[PDB]
């Protein structure tokens, strides 16, 4: 003799020892990224090609 | 004489010694992957090509 069993309810596991099907469908995906940058240029110049006489002292 | 046998119920195994057909259909597939990376560059420079006279001491 087994216990009371419902009629219209689905067959769910209810006690220790009942079986149940697992459908393994796992799909995980993670990601990350980053960056950084910096820059600097400089260029100076000056040239007195032909100096007049009254400025030759400087 | 064999025991009571139902009429409309399907032929399921009920006692020790009854036979039952298993349809082996197994298909499992798992996978995983990962990665990582890092990078760094640097480049500095400085050059005094033509130094004026009043700065020659530095």
UniProtKB/Swiss-Prot annotation, chains A, B:
Mark the transmembrane ranges. Answer: none
Localization, UniProt? Cell outer membrane; Bacterial flagellum basal body
- How does it associate, per the subunit comment? The basal body constitutes a major portion of the flagellar organelle and consists of four rings (L,P,S, and M) mounted on a central rod.
Per the record, the similarity remark reads: Belongs to the FlgH family.
Role this protein plays: Assembles around the rod to form the L-ring and probably protects the motor/basal body from shearing forces during rotation.
Q: What protein does this entry describe? A: Flagellar L-ring protein
């Amino acid at each position: 003799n087994y216990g009371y069993q419902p009629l219209f309810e689905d067959r769910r596991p209810r006690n220790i020892g009942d079986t149940l099907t697992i459908v393994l469908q796992e799909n995980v995906s993670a990601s990350k990224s980053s960056s950084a940058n910096a820059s600097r240029d400089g260029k100076t110049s000056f040239g007195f090609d032909t100096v007049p006489r009254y400025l030759q002292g400087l």
